[PDB]
Each structure stands twice: as structure tokens, then as C-alpha cells.
């Protein structure tokens, strides 16, 4: 059956539904918990009061 | 840096942290060193060597 | 009838496929799983069945412990391939085994007893005259129609790409990425958990598989998905479980194919599909990679999610100088590609010398199949 | 083989003698150093490398340098506390500008000696003292 | 806390047995090779002097 | 009777940290004498092949 | 006196090493290598640490993902070689930087901007008082203790081949060829897989670093070699991963080696080694030829393997007219050779002269290095 | 152990009647070193058996019964579940992680909750991992003797660190992102 048909690319074995729907991405790292925050560079978190007791 | 940490940084110059004692020779000159020395040297030391067996 | 049909029997980690030289179509095509029972029979004089093997193992799901001969494209079991292979030609076929040249397919790296192995089974068992044993990939070109191109063959078991141009394959550029569909399986049944859905037994990760061939799609932007199903609930399906129960699978139609793009999922540190093709270009020769980005072909079941080209091309033409043009070529049968192109290979006539005949195995061991394929 | 052992023989005799050497007299002149500031508050240390693993003794040495009080050490005698310690004393060397690198809080309690030989060479050398 | 302990004492002192145990095994293995050295001197004495 | 066998487990360790010490020193003095030796065999061998 | 002794840094590929001028040997030995994690800190409590340098990156391998400053002899990422000098500094031998001149190694044939950015960071980040960069071959060729010679050094990311004939540098003649031992460690994972072992991450790569070190030796003859290995089971080592887990690497012990002398083997068109330095030779004059064949000077941990010499003699030997001496030196401390070459460069009286000033960089820029250095 | 209880003739059905299953387990199992030998054993004699006193003054007799419960901890085939056992799934997430930090991993083995507080539960854990485990690595099983209420004492020891109290999620926040802010927060 190969021997007859000229282009396998183009051959149907169901209807299949297709198409029914409707810069790469950067490499990303899971989150840390085990420091707060690096928004401020050389900052103590020792110094800084707690944050629900800021009011 | 005050005066007393300037003896420490002027002593951490040397290879080893101590200044060296003079008398002793220096690790270029000691029998340490593994390059390989000119052929007459070795010429030398084989003709003394020579010469205490004799 | 001097030459007759030899069958072409394609076997992967997810289904076994099976057909004659000429056909378009396989023959048979069923799941790789071995069954046995777990409980005990109670009514005296049904019928003893030690295992089950193909289809009759997926009807009866639920009472059997559902076993894979193939882990990652090795063959780690081998009287369940033998279970198979018999399976395959006295039942599925009803032909004679020992009257027919096999054609057999196999992942690019792999250890070589494996290769040894199943030629010293095809021919001390089933007593076959001659036997040859392909790369996929390679297959894949044959079933395009083009003999320059990349491949990339995405199965259940790996995920491999090899260039070849005008004929000549380079090995050097040939990579083995282990990610594969089972992975995405597990990934997805990790994921499942969070809304509360509890699948945990062999027999319910077939559940989970057609789950995820049926309600899963590759986002073309990942973090505007992200914020559209964050925002409204439009994006969301509902499933039928086999006993009447209704899951609204939601947000995670998107996060299970993710995976192959971003493996940092999963926990590996290896590049993705994309980046993998990409490298596997920039390891070849400076001339042949205008021809190699124009030949971009897919291969294999996993490449089957909606939208998966779309991602690709696009990854590909962030990754690549902007000069030139790709073209991603995804046919419509590429579930079949290596069985077809497979076919193709047993239809030419220079094919007959290549054969392992049974007269070389017996003067040179298994070994031979290390000169003859490949 | 032979040549193997005679490069093995080379590196463990003339790399290691040399390296001890030279961190030995550089111990021993930390030591001495650190003493002296110590000494105001009426603390010191035998050995360099095992008495800086609890951390107190570090954030005593800041408290004496900077003149400013540090907050207060965990109360505890764990592992997480020794850690807790020696990450407020990093903090505190981050906080003026004192650039430090390869230097975590589980490397100065594990007690790496090159390590601790390089956080007192650079409290020596960058930090400022006023008196 | 007595129990306690006399957990960690009886730790502290099964390490001090087990390096103890490597220690010896070193110093034979040194002194062999040392012995090994020893004898390869007349024979290589030997040649240089013939 | 456990403050009776804390001093008991504590002598063990005592002398067991005591001698592993020794047993150091002797190692550490082993191989340097053994690299020393090794050394002074290649000079004999540079004689020869000379 | 007012003599201060300069530091000697050899960075490489692989490792860095650093010392005083005028020593043995140096102070410093650690591996090149930038780690940073890749998994979930949960542990809060714990100091954080952003970046493992050297020796601590390598005892804590297994969270972090490896990365080589230094590739293929040129330098990409400029910060973390930054940490690699900074590191070395202050952590491995505790000096200040502004109080004594450096001295710096590189390959032959490199990016030209390399050397300018090596100045720049230099003399502006760490205020030295002056700096020189020279060439890895010539301070072998100084460690070697002779002023003719033709000396070939291959790291762990270039090979290079120079011949200087009584003081006078031949730059027609200087070969730069890219195979190294990263390659060589590429290639020792390619051929693992046949076996049947998986080593994928940068963890595993250091793991199949430690096995080429440890069991690998180079065949006087291959053909010959690889029929005794077929033969019998004789040529088998077993080594031991760090999970416990034992493998055995048989056949593969010499096939990794083999790839310096063909490298067809990697899918590279340029000639061995061998060939390399034969072509460098016959590339000189006519009469400085037969000097430059008693000579031959080998350099670097990639010339480390056992068996190498007497290889490289009998190649040279069958290439070389039947006539004339050939004689490979290979002292036995060589991986170290040129460090020690650049503790002779900073130790002579006329060297003084030689250094690249702070005010010479100021009133010319950074491009002094090219008027100044070979 | 209902189930297996049912098959001495004691019958215990209602939700209070639990309890009472609980505390007889609680106190009247244990680990068996070897199953099967301790089957031969319990079959042979009538040395194992133990007694136990109802609430309204009935006496029982536990025997078999007692090492048999514990087993399905290693056994899931015994409730039905084929999944596998303890020793299984703590080898296997071992097996999980990277080659390098297993050899830790094999030596710092920590239990922890009520259910691990079954006499001889920490022989049996470590015989059966050595048994999976190659014989070059050593395996150390940690069982601190109070360690029902480790989940809690750890707890109490989170909350008293300098930087937890940079670890909170405040009133405030909780006001200005709803709910959903435990997943942002909370590991
Ligand atoms: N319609 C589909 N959509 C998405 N994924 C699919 C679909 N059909 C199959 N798959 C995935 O592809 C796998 C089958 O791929 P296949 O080409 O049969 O692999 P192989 O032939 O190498 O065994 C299945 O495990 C499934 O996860
Ligand atoms: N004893 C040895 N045997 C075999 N190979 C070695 C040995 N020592 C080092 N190597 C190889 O040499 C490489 C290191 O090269 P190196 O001399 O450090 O280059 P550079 O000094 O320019 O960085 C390593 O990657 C390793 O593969």
C-alpha cells in the first residue's frame, strides 16, 4: 500500500479532531523559605522588629 | 588601621609568616629543588665524588 | 511466491505495533502490559489464566497487578517479552514466526546486551530465518519522505534526536534526553493531589494516562496562562472517572506538558526538548545547519499535545539568529511514523543483502548484530 | 604508577609542608591578635579553630571592635543556634560594607580552618577599629 | 537527663575506638613501605656502583 | 546507680582520647620519615640511569 | 632589603594554583569550579549562602549545579572568576593584594580582549602595584631547566605545542589544538553507556573525572590491545561509586585515551597529537630540526596518563627520518611544571624591569598588555 | 486488629467499642524480629499468649494476634493495598535522590510519631534496610524515647529563632491578599 501512494506525510488513519483548541522563556528555579527577603542588600533582618507587630 | 595590625599585615608578606633566620640558605639554593641543574655542574660533582672514593 | 512479506514489529515502552512489509497500516497495535492476579479464586472450575498479556490485562484492570517489560527503552524483563512476542505472532497475526524475516526497532543509546539479547531470542526461540534490528529515528526520516532533517522522537520510554544530511547521520550529535511521557504520568498524578483526588494503584495509573491524553495542551505563553486561569475559570474540563465519579481537572491541563519544556519540575537539571534540539544543531558542521533548521521533523506519541509545534518553532526561533527561517514539520500520523517508515525499509530491493542471515548468527555468535545493524 | 607515586610523593610532601607551615605561624599570630582584644571583657581562647564554633566568641570580638552592642545571642546549645549566631555576626560584616565570600554560617561552625583563617585575616585587614 | 548522658559519652567513645582502629592500620601500612624502601637501596646501589 | 557509671564510661573515654593522640603523633612521624626515605631512593636511581 | 616576594597564580582550565615567587611549590591547589543550589531551603534557622567556591563547592556537590568559569582555555563568566581570584586571595593564602605584583599564565592563541580585561580587573578591583601575563609553554619550558626545546602542553581545556630554539620563539610554527581532557571526560561518558551505566548531571561528570583519573592508561598498540581485552577478561578493574553501588569498566580503560592519538573518534577532522607536533617540528628551520627532536618537552595533568611516553616516542620515532635522536622528557612532577616555571619568571634580577607599572597602565589604557607581554 | 480479633470469637462492632481496640493494640503489640519463625513459635507453644482485663470485668486472651497487627505495617498485602511497605517507600525515597548525599542519607535515618512506637520496631526497620541497602554503607536508625512528641518539641523550638520572627504572615498581609497567601509564605 506504500507502493502506491507518492507522500506519507500527507495520510489520514482517522479524522483525529485536530486544532479543536480555540523570546523564549527564561530558565526558573524553585522558591527558597529559609530567608525572608533580598529586596535590601546588606540589610540585618536582626535589627528589624517583627512584621504583626508593626502596626 | 591603627599601628598594631600594620606589624601583623608586614608579616604576613614573607612566604612563610616569620621572617626568615639569614644563616640558613635559600630553597633555590638547597638540594630541594627537583629541575635538573647544568651538565658541567653534575660534571663537577661527579669528579669530586671521583676523588673522595678514589 | 519466491520472496515473501516480512513483518515489522515496533515495540516502545508505552505500545507494541505490529504489521507486514507492504501495508500502510499496522496489523495490531496494544498496550506493553503484563498482568497477574493478586487475589485468590474462590469458584471452583472457571479457568486457569497465570497471566494476562495485551488487552485482556486493560479490561480487567482493577483486579490484576499491571506489570512494563520496558523501563526507559531497556528491556528489563524478558519472559514477559517473550509473553509478548508469542502474543504478537500466533495471536494477533496467526502466522507462522519461523517463515517471515522480523524487522525490529530500537532506541540510538542503549546498552549492548540488550541488542544481544534479542537477536539470540529471535533466533534460538522462535527460529527465525533472518532478523534486522533499526534506530527509530533513522525510521522516521523514511516515513517523511526527505532524506535530510533532524529528528526528534519523543516516546514513553526517551526522548532522542538525531541529524542526518543527504544520508549520512553524524553520531557525535546524537542525544538521549531521558524525559519521556511516563514522567509526565507521574508528574501529573503528583499534581492531581492538590485538588484533593487520590490515584495510587497500578491500576489506576491508565486512568491517569487518559486523563492527560485527553484534557492536556501545551500553553503557548506559560505566565499568561498562568494569569488567565488565575483570573476566570473559562479554561476548565470535566472528566468521567469509570465508576460515575466527575473530576474538574482546571488549571493543571497546562502544568502536566509544561514539564518538557522547563524539567526543572521534575527535579532535573537537564535542558529541554527545545534546548536540546538546539544543541543537538550546534554540534554539526557550519553548512549543513541551514538545511537543518529548514528539516525540523517530530516523531513519537509524546509530541501529540495540542500546540506542542507552536512552542517549538517559536523556542527554536528565540534561540536561533534571526536570518533564517524554521519550519517545524509535525504530520498528523506521527504516532505511526516509526512503524511506517519501518515498512518502507522492507519494501526495498538492495534491502535483502543487509539481512543477519541464520547461517552468520551460527558461525558468530549474538555478536553479529554489532557489525551488521548500524 | 611509579610516576604517579613520584607526583603523589611531590604534592603530599612539598604542597601540605608548606601549607601547614605557613597556617600554623598564621594561627598562632591570630591567636595572639585576637587575644588582646578579648581581653577587655575578660574572655579568651585557647584554640582558634574550635572556640569560634559556638559563636559567642565572635560576637563578643565584634562587640569589642565596633562599640556598638549586637543583638543578643539565641539562647540555645544546638546545632540551629550556633548557626543562628554566626548569621548575625555575618549580618553585622555585611552591614559595613566588609565584602566576604565563601564564607556561610555552617562553614565557620563545621570549623574549616581556611575558612576561619580568612575571616580574621579580613577582620584584620578591611574592618575599621575606633577607639 | 542522666540517661541522656550516658548516651552521648558512650558515642563519643566508639568514635575514639574507631579512629584508633584506622590509626593502627596506617602505621603498619607505613612502616611496610618504609621496609619496601629500604631494600630497593642495595640493589640500586649495586647497579650504580658496578 | 546511673551517677555511679558516669565516672566509669567517662575514664574509658579518657584513655581511649589519650592514646588515639599517641597513636597520631606515631603516624604522622611514620610518614614523614617514609617520604624522606622515598626521596632518597630517586637520587640513587638519577645516579644510575646518569 | 624592601624585596617582596610576587605571587605566581596559574589559572587553568581545570584547577587554580597559587604560590610566592622564589618557593618549591605552591601554597594553593583547588578546583575551578563555581556551584550554586538548585533545590527547596526549608531548613530556616541556617545561615544562606549564595555561591560555593573551590573545595567547598566540591564536598557539597550534590545540591549544587557546577559551572567552569574557565572553558576551552578563554574565560566567559567574569564574575565568578572574579570569586575564583578573590577566593584565592584572601582565603587560600592570605595576603593583601595591593602590597605585592602578580603574575598570570594563558594559552598561546586566544580572544585578544581577554588579555586587556585581565589587566582591568587587575589593576582597578584589587589595586596590585603591578602585573605580567605570560604563556603557559614558555614557563614550562623554564621549569624544564633548558634553553631549546619543543614543548607541548595540554590542560584540561587546550592543547598547545611551541618550539623555541636557543631563546628565539618560533610564531609560525605555535599549533593550538582544541582536545583536552573535558573532552576526554565527554567522551568516557559517551562510551560508560554501553555498559549500561547513566552518568547525566555535573555531579556524575565530576564522578566520571575521578574514574578517567584513577583507572585509564594509554595501549602501546590499540589494535592489539583491543584483541586481548576481546580475548579474555584479564584487562578488568572494578571501582566503586559513592552510593556504594560497584561497577566494572573492562573494555573501556584505553578506548578514552586513544581519542588524544585519533581524534575521529570525536568527529574532529585534526590530526593526534603526535602528528601535531611532528607537523610544529617540520614547520622550523632545517638546521634547528635536529635539536628540537632530542628535546621534546612534555607539560600538563592530560600528559599525566601512564604509558603516554613511550606512545608519543614510537609515533614520532615511525614519523621521524631513521636517522636522529628522539627523546621524550617528561619530568614527573609535570602537572605542576608551569607554576613552577612562573616561580623562576618573578625570582630573576631582570625581570625587574618587566613589570607592567600602575602608571604605565594609566597613561595608556589597557591595551600596554599587548606592547609589554609575549 | 478488629478484623483479626473476629476470628477468636470476640465480637467488637460499635464506635466506642474502637477505643477499646486501640488501647488492647497499644498496649499488647509488638514487632516480630522474624514473621515466620515467630509464627512456628507461637503455634508450637502457648508461652506468647497475654490476658487483658474488658471494661465490665471480662478477660481476653490476645495471643497470635499480637505480632500480627504490627506486621501489616511491612505486609501491605494484609489490608488489602498493594502498595509497598515501610521499609520499601524509606528506601525508595532514598533511592530518589542524587548519588552524592545518599551515604548521609543512610546513616541519619530519624523516626518519629506514635504509630513508630511499637517495641522492636527499630531492629526491624534497620535488619530490612541493611537487607536492601549494598553491605558497604552503614545504616543508623535514630529512635529518641520520646519522640511522640517530636512533631511538637521541634515546633517549640521554630518558634523561639531570631528570624522567625521575619517568617510570620501578618494580619496586614492576610487583609491585603486574601487567603491565598499561605502558599506564597508557608513552605
Ligand atoms: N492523543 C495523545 N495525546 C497526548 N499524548 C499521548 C496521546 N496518545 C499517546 N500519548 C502519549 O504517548 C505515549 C505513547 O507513545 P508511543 O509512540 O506509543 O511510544 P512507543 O511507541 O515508543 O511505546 C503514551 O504513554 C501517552 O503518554
Ligand atoms: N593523574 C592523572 N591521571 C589522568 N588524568 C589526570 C590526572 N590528573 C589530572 N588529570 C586530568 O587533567 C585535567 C586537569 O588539567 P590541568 O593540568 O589542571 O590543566 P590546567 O592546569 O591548565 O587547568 C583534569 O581534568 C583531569 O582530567
Not at chain 3, 494476562?52 to 523501563?71: F, H, M, N
Not at chain 3, 538545511?291 to 509530541?303: F, K, M, R
Not at chain 4, 579553630?49 to 570580638?61: A, S, T, V
Request: hydrophobic share 35%.
Amino acid at each position: 500500500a506504500i507502493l502506491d501512494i507518492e507522500r506519507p506525510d500527507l495520510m489520514i488513519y482517522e479524522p483525529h479532531f485536530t486544532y479543536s483548541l480555540l523570546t523564549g522563556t527564561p530558565r526558573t528555579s524553585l522558591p527558597h523559605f529559609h530567608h525572608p527577603e533580598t529586596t535590601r542588600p546588606d540589610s540585618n533582618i536582626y535589627k528589624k522588629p517583627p512584621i504583626y507587630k508593626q502596626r | 588601621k591603627h599601628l598594631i595590625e600594620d606589624l601583623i599585615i608586614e608579616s604576613s608578606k614573607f612566604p612563610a609568616a616569620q621572617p626568615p633566620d639569614p644563616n640558613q640558605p635559600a630553597k633555590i639554593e638547597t638540594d630541594y629543588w627537583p629541575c635538573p641543574p647544568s651538565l658541567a655542574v653534575v660534571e663537577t660533582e661527579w669528579r669530586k665524588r671521583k676523588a673522595s672514593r678514589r | 511466491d519466491d520472496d515473501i512479506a516480512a513483518l515489522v514489529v515496533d515495540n516502545g515502552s508505552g505500545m507494541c505495533k505490529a504489521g507486514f512489509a507492504g501495508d500502510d497500516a499496522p496489523r495490531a497495535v496494544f498496550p506493553s502490559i503484563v498482568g497477574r492476579p493478586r487475589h485468590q479464586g474462590v469458584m471452583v472450575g472457571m479457568g486457569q489464566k497465570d497471566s494476562y498479556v495485551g488487552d485482556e490485562a486493560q479490561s480487567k484492570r482493577g483486579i490484576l497487578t499491571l506489570k512494563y517489560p520496558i523501563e526507559h527503552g531497556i528491556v528489563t524483563n524478558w519472559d514477559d517479552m517473550e509473553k509478548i512476542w508469542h502474543h504478537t505472532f500466533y495471536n494477533e497475526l496467526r502466522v507462522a514466526p519461523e517463515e517471515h524475516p522480523v524487522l525490529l526497532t530500537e532506541a540510538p543509546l542503549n546498552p549492548k546486551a540488550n541488542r544481544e539479547k534479542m537477536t539470540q531470542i529471535m533466533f534460538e526461540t522462535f527460529n527465525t530465518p533472518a532478523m534486522y534490528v533499526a534506530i527509530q529515528a533513522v525510521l522516521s526520516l523514511y516515513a517523511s519522505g526527505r532524506t535530510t532533517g533532524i529528528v526528534m522522537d519523543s516516546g514513553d520510554g526517551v526522548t532522542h534526536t538525531v541529524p542526518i544530511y543527504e544520508g549520512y547521520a553524524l553520531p557525535h550529535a546524537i542525544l538521549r534526553l531521558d524525559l519521556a511521557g511516563r514522567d509526565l504520568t507521574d508528574y501529573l498524578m503528583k499534581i492531581l493531589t492538590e485538588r484533593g483526588y487520590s490515584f495510587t494503584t497500578t491500576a489506576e495509573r491508565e486512568i491517569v494516562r487518559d486523563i492527560k491524553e485527553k484534557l492536556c495542551y501545551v500553553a503557548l505563553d506559560f505566565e499568561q496562562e498562568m494569569a488567565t486561569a488565575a483570573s476566570s475559570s473559562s479554561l476548565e474540563k470535566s472528566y468521567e472517572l469509570p465508576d460515575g465519579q466527575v473530576i474538574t481537572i482546571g488549571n493543571e491541563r497546562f502544568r502536566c506538558p509544561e514539564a518538557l519544556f522547563q524539567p526543572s519540575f521534575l527535579g532535573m537539571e537537564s535542558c529541554g526538548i527545545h534546548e536540546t534540539t538546539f544543541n543537538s544543531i550546534m554540534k554539526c558542521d557550519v553548512d549543513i545547519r541551514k538545511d537543518l533548521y529548514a528539516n525540523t521533523v517530530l516523531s513519537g506519541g509524546t509530541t501529540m499535545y495540542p500546540g506542542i509545534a507552536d512552542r517549538m518553532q517559536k523556542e527554536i526561533t528565540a534561540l536561533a539568529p534571526s536570518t533564517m527561517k524554521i519550519k517545524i514539520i509535525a504530520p498528523p500520523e506521527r504516532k505511526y511514523s516509526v512503524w511506517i517508515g519501518g515498512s518502507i525499509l522492507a519494501s526495498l530491493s538492495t534491502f535483502q543483502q543487509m539481512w543477519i542471515s541464520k547461517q552468520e548468527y551460527d558461525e558468530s555468535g549474538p555478536s553479529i548484530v554489532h557489525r551488521k545493524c548500524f | 604508577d611509579n610516576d604517579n607515586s613520584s607526583a603523589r610523593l611531590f604534592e603530599r610532601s612539598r604542597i601540605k609542608a608548606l601549607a601547614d607551615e605557613r597556617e600554623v605561624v598564621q594561627k598562632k599570630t591570630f591567636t595572639k591578635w585576637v587575644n588582646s582584644h578579648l581581653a577587655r571583657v575578660s574572655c579568651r581562647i585557647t584554640d582558634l579553630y574550635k572556640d569560634l564554633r559556638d559563636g559567642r566568641m565572635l560576637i563578643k570580638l565584634l562587640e569589642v571592635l565596633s562599640g556598638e552592642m549586637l543583638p543578643k545571642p539565641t539562647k540555645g546549645k544546638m546545632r540551629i543556634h550556633c548557626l543562628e549566631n554566626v548569621d548575625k555576626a555575618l549580618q553585622f560584616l555585611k552591614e559595613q560594607r566588609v565584602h566576604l565570600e565563601n564564607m556561610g554560617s555552617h562553614d565557620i561552625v563545621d570549623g574549616n580552618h581556611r575558612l576561619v583563617l580568612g575571616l580574621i585575616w579580613t577582620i584584620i585587614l578591611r574592618f575599621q577599629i575606633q577607639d | 537527663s542522666l540517661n541522656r548522658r550516658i548516651q552521648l559519652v558512650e558515642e563519643e567513645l566508639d568514635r575514639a575506638q574507631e579512629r584508633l582502629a584506622t590509626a593502627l592500620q596506617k602505621l603498619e601500612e607505613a612502616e611496610k613501605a618504609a621496609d619496601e624502601s629500604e631494600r630497593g637501596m642495595k640493589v640500586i646501589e649495586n647497579r650504580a656502583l658496578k | 546507680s546511673l551517677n555511679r557509671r558516669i565516672q566509669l564510661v567517662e575514664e574509658e573515654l579518657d584513655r581511649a582520647q589519650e592514646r588515639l593522640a599517641t597513636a597520631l603523633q606515631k603516624l604522622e612521624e611514620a610518614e614523614k620519615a617514609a617520604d624522606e626515605s622515598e626521596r632518597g631512593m630517586k637520587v640513587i636511581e638519577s645516579r644510575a640511569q646518569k
